[PDB]
Design an enzyme around this catalytic site. Sequence first.
Site, PDB file in Angstrom:
ATOM      1  N   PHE A  60      42.513  46.045  46.761  1.00  0.00           N
ATOM      2  CA  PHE A  60      43.351  45.062  47.431  1.00  0.00           C
ATOM      3  C   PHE A  60      44.206  44.395  46.434  1.00  0.00           C
ATOM      4  O   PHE A  60      43.831  43.971  45.351  1.00  0.00           O
ATOM      5  CB  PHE A  60      42.424  44.060  48.187  1.00  0.00           C
ATOM      6  CG  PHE A  60      41.710  44.681  49.329  1.00  0.00           C
ATOM      7  CD1 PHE A  60      40.687  45.568  49.149  1.00  0.00           C
ATOM      8  CD2 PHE A  60      42.081  44.344  50.630  1.00  0.00           C
ATOM      9  CE1 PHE A  60      40.045  46.178  50.212  1.00  0.00           C
ATOM     10  CE2 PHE A  60      41.449  44.946  51.757  1.00  0.00           C
ATOM     11  CZ  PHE A  60      40.447  45.851  51.550  1.00  0.00           C
ATOM     12  N   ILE A  62      46.824  41.494  46.985  1.00  0.00           N
ATOM     13  CA  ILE A  62      47.417  40.542  47.925  1.00  0.00           C
ATOM     14  C   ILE A  62      48.004  39.455  47.118  1.00  0.00           C
ATOM     15  O   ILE A  62      47.489  39.033  46.075  1.00  0.00           O
ATOM     16  CB  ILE A  62      46.308  40.094  48.939  1.00  0.00           C
ATOM     17  CG1 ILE A  62      45.692  41.261  49.739  1.00  0.00           C
ATOM     18  CG2 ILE A  62      46.786  38.910  49.870  1.00  0.00           C
ATOM     19  CD1 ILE A  62      46.661  42.008  50.369  1.00  0.00           C
ATOM     20  N   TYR A  65      48.533  39.321  43.102  1.00  0.00           N
ATOM     21  CA  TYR A  65      47.721  40.377  42.488  1.00  0.00           C
ATOM     22  C   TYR A  65      48.312  41.723  42.582  1.00  0.00           C
ATOM     23  O   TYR A  65      47.842  42.651  41.912  1.00  0.00           O
ATOM     24  CB  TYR A  65      46.311  40.454  43.107  1.00  0.00           C
ATOM     25  CG  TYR A  65      45.364  39.381  42.649  1.00  0.00           C
ATOM     26  CD1 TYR A  65      44.158  39.726  42.086  1.00  0.00           C
ATOM     27  CD2 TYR A  65      45.681  38.009  42.800  1.00  0.00           C
ATOM     28  CE1 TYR A  65      43.261  38.717  41.617  1.00  0.00           C
ATOM     29  CE2 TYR A  65      44.793  36.995  42.358  1.00  0.00           C
ATOM     30  CZ  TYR A  65      43.580  37.399  41.784  1.00  0.00           C
ATOM     31  OH  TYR A  65      42.705  36.379  41.353  1.00  0.00           O
ATOM     32  N   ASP A 148      37.726  45.704  42.535  1.00  0.00           N
ATOM     33  CA  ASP A 148      38.797  44.701  42.199  1.00  0.00           C
ATOM     34  C   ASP A 148      39.984  45.360  41.484  1.00  0.00           C
ATOM     35  O   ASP A 148      39.837  46.328  40.794  1.00  0.00           O
ATOM     36  CB  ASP A 148      38.180  43.644  41.248  1.00  0.00           C
ATOM     37  CG  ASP A 148      37.361  42.603  42.013  1.00  0.00           C
ATOM     38  OD1 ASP A 148      36.882  42.788  43.134  1.00  0.00           O
ATOM     39  OD2 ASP A 148      37.243  41.507  41.410  1.00  0.00           O
ATOM     40  N   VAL A 149      41.155  44.689  41.678  1.00  0.00           N
ATOM     41  CA  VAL A 149      42.427  45.194  41.135  1.00  0.00           C
ATOM     42  C   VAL A 149      42.727  44.660  39.704  1.00  0.00           C
ATOM     43  O   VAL A 149      43.483  45.280  38.951  1.00  0.00           O
ATOM     44  CB  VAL A 149      43.607  44.880  42.120  1.00  0.00           C
ATOM     45  CG1 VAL A 149      43.989  43.425  42.072  1.00  0.00           C
ATOM     46  CG2 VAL A 149      44.775  45.822  41.676  1.00  0.00           C
ATOM     47  N   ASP A 150      42.139  43.477  39.415  1.00  0.00           N
ATOM     48  CA  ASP A 150      42.444  42.737  38.188  1.00  0.00           C
ATOM     49  C   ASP A 150      41.591  43.354  37.033  1.00  0.00           C
ATOM     50  O   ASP A 150      40.910  42.616  36.314  1.00  0.00           O
ATOM     51  CB  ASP A 150      42.152  41.218  38.347  1.00  0.00           C
ATOM     52  CG  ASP A 150      40.743  40.938  38.795  1.00  0.00           C
ATOM     53  OD1 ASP A 150      40.100  41.648  39.611  1.00  0.00           O
ATOM     54  OD2 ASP A 150      40.048  39.958  38.351  1.00  0.00           O
ATOM     55  N   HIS A 170      26.063  43.053  37.494  1.00  0.00           N
ATOM     56  CA  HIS A 170      27.015  42.059  37.051  1.00  0.00           C
ATOM     57  C   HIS A 170      26.831  41.841  35.551  1.00  0.00           C
ATOM     58  O   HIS A 170      25.687  41.743  35.072  1.00  0.00           O
ATOM     59  CB  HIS A 170      26.737  40.807  37.835  1.00  0.00           C
ATOM     60  CG  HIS A 170      27.706  39.701  37.584  1.00  0.00           C
ATOM     61  ND1 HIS A 170      28.374  39.025  38.567  1.00  0.00           N
ATOM     62  CD2 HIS A 170      28.055  39.122  36.409  1.00  0.00           C
ATOM     63  CE1 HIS A 170      29.077  38.031  38.017  1.00  0.00           C
ATOM     64  NE2 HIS A 170      28.869  38.076  36.712  1.00  0.00           N
ATOM     65  N   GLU A 240      30.308  38.586  47.594  1.00  0.00           N
ATOM     66  CA  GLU A 240      29.323  39.021  46.574  1.00  0.00           C
ATOM     67  C   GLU A 240      27.932  38.540  46.951  1.00  0.00           C
ATOM     68  O   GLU A 240      26.965  39.306  46.718  1.00  0.00           O
ATOM     69  CB  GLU A 240      29.688  38.562  45.185  1.00  0.00           C
ATOM     70  CG  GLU A 240      28.634  38.826  44.058  1.00  0.00           C
ATOM     71  CD  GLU A 240      29.251  38.482  42.745  1.00  0.00           C
ATOM     72  OE1 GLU A 240      28.952  37.355  42.267  1.00  0.00           O
ATOM     73  OE2 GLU A 240      30.030  39.291  42.196  1.00  0.00           O
TER      74      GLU A 240
HETATM   75  O1  LIG Z   1      45.110  36.220  45.771  1.00  0.00           O
HETATM   76  C1  LIG Z   1      44.319  37.170  45.768  1.00  0.00           C
HETATM   77  C2  LIG Z   1      42.961  36.952  45.547  1.00  0.00           C
HETATM   78  C3  LIG Z   1      42.086  38.033  45.455  1.00  0.00           C
HETATM   79  N1  LIG Z   1      42.553  39.358  45.677  1.00  0.00           N
HETATM   80  C4  LIG Z   1      41.765  40.572  45.672  1.00  0.00           C
HETATM   81  O2  LIG Z   1      40.329  40.077  45.679  1.00  0.00           O
HETATM   82  C5  LIG Z   1      39.712  40.622  44.491  1.00  0.00           C
HETATM   83  C6  LIG Z   1      38.602  39.611  43.987  1.00  0.00           C
HETATM   84  O3  LIG Z   1      39.276  38.348  43.594  1.00  0.00           O
HETATM   85  P1  LIG Z   1      39.306  38.037  42.073  1.00  0.00           P
HETATM   86  O4  LIG Z   1      39.572  39.248  41.198  1.00  0.00           O
HETATM   87  O5  LIG Z   1      40.249  36.852  41.994  1.00  0.00           O
HETATM   88  O6  LIG Z   1      37.814  37.469  41.828  1.00  0.00           O
HETATM   89  P2  LIG Z   1      37.149  37.358  40.372  1.00  0.00           P
HETATM   90  O7  LIG Z   1      36.959  38.699  39.735  1.00  0.00           O
HETATM   91  O8  LIG Z   1      38.158  36.548  39.407  1.00  0.00           O
HETATM   92  O9  LIG Z   1      35.864  36.456  40.622  1.00  0.00           O
HETATM   93  C7  LIG Z   1      40.825  40.811  43.482  1.00  0.00           C
HETATM   94  O10 LIG Z   1      40.532  41.750  42.445  1.00  0.00           O
HETATM   95  C8  LIG Z   1      41.920  41.403  44.415  1.00  0.00           C
HETATM   96  O11 LIG Z   1      41.587  42.755  44.715  1.00  0.00           O
HETATM   97  C9  LIG Z   1      43.917  39.542  45.922  1.00  0.00           C
HETATM   98  O12 LIG Z   1      44.290  40.676  46.075  1.00  0.00           O
HETATM   99  N2  LIG Z   1      44.784  38.460  45.944  1.00  0.00           N
HETATM  100  O1  LIG Z   2      27.753  33.883  39.305  1.00  0.00           O
HETATM  101  C1  LIG Z   2      28.560  34.863  39.893  1.00  0.00           C
HETATM  102  C2  LIG Z   2      30.034  34.706  39.417  1.00  0.00           C
HETATM  103  O2  LIG Z   2      30.076  35.050  38.062  1.00  0.00           O
HETATM  104  C3  LIG Z   2      31.409  34.923  37.539  1.00  0.00           C
HETATM  105  O3  LIG Z   2      31.317  35.289  36.188  1.00  0.00           O
HETATM  106  C4  LIG Z   2      32.417  35.799  38.280  1.00  0.00           C
HETATM  107  O4  LIG Z   2      33.707  35.481  37.836  1.00  0.00           O
HETATM  108  C5  LIG Z   2      32.417  35.438  39.730  1.00  0.00           C
HETATM  109  O5  LIG Z   2      33.273  36.277  40.439  1.00  0.00           O
HETATM  110  C6  LIG Z   2      30.960  35.555  40.242  1.00  0.00           C
HETATM  111  O6  LIG Z   2      30.496  36.893  40.168  1.00  0.00           O
HETATM  112 MN   LIG Z   3      38.254  40.334  39.857  1.00  0.00          MN
END
Ligand SMILES: O=c1ccn([C@@H]2O[C@H](COP(=O)(O)OP(=O)(O)O)[C@@H](O)[C@H]2O)c(=O)[nH]1
Ligand SMILES: OC[C@H]1O[C@@H](O)[C@H](O)[C@@H](O)[C@H]1O
Ligand SMILES: [Mn+2]
Length: 286
Positions: A60, A62, A65, A148-150, A170, A240
């Site tokens: 995704f 969105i 991103y 995830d995309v990031d 994790h 999650e």
């Molecule tokens: O504004 C947004 C927020 C989240 N995501 C999607 O939701 C996933 C999980 O969000 P994010 O990576 O922000 O979570 P994190 O890894 O930082 O906890 C992202 O990789 C994207 O695929 C998106 O596409 N646009």
């Molecule tokens: O405690 C769980 C959390 O841990 C962070 O490191 C991560 O960025 C979050 O997305 C979530 O997984």
């Molecule tokens: Mn992410």
Amino acid sequence: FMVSLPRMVYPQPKVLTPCRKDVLVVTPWLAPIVWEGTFNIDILNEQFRLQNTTIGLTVFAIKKYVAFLKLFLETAEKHFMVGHRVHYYVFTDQPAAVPRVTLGTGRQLSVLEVRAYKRWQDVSMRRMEMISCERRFLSEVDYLVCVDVDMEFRDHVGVEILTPLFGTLHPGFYGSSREAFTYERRPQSQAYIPKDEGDFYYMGAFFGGSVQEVQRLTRACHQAMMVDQANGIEAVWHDESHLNKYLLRHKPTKVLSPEYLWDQQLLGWPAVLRKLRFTAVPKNHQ
Ligand SMILES: O=c1ccn([C@@H]2O[C@H](COP(=O)(O)OP(=O)(O)O)[C@@H](O)[C@H]2O)c(=O)[nH]1
Ligand SMILES: OC[C@H]1O[C@@H](O)[C@H](O)[C@@H](O)[C@H]1O
Ligand SMILES: [Mn+2]
């Protein structure tokens, strides 16, 4: 029906010598935990090519991103299931912002327009509903991988991950005792897990399995998140937390090690990780 493997010449596995002595390589329900040195990728590649396996990858992108898609896709082309059939499914609110990435043979990309939600949490959470596209995946791929995309691929991610159902450890919690896991702890949530339960803390950024098992998983997590919404509760780690509840009650048939989901900026490169395969790209919160 599976045809015979061809003759192959490779090192003999020896039962009185472990591949890895430093880590747990099988769960107590007899699911492999995938670390480098546990698999001969040449045997696995043969087994999966003889089934003409097709892997779908959902991602995704969105709102902002979409900026992450170029690096995500270009590095997927260098490292993700190379040699196998791959179908990318890019879910976005901005089809025109999807970069034109050149793909290797046998690989395809579909752009699926979806709605954007205002809240970061709803964008992340509504992936389960969006994934559970059901009929299309059943016709087009054998396995689905949901990430995830990031992120970027830095090293091999291949068919050693494929199985009916997998989660990924994790990277913040693989060495933690269960009571330290950040499971949802409120009994009023469907994602609730008591302090004396839990095998692992799986990250929401990388799970997958056969289409059937991934549709089971995402349907169950979407239903559970709807129950919570109706009850006025939002799980502490959103989708999650529900993935964790599902994987505690439906054990995955493989678990990927943190090689497969890492953050070198926050966690460095420990000796226990021989490869860093799929890693976070730096980003501002916000
Ligand atoms: O504004 C947004 C927020 C989240 N995501 C999607 O939701 C996933 C999980 O969000 P994010 O990576 O922000 O979570 P994190 O890894 O930082 O906890 C992202 O990789 C994207 O695929 C998106 O596409 N646009
Ligand atoms: O405690 C769980 C959390 O841990 C962070 O490191 C991560 O960025 C979050 O997305 C979530 O997984
Ligand atoms: Mn992410």
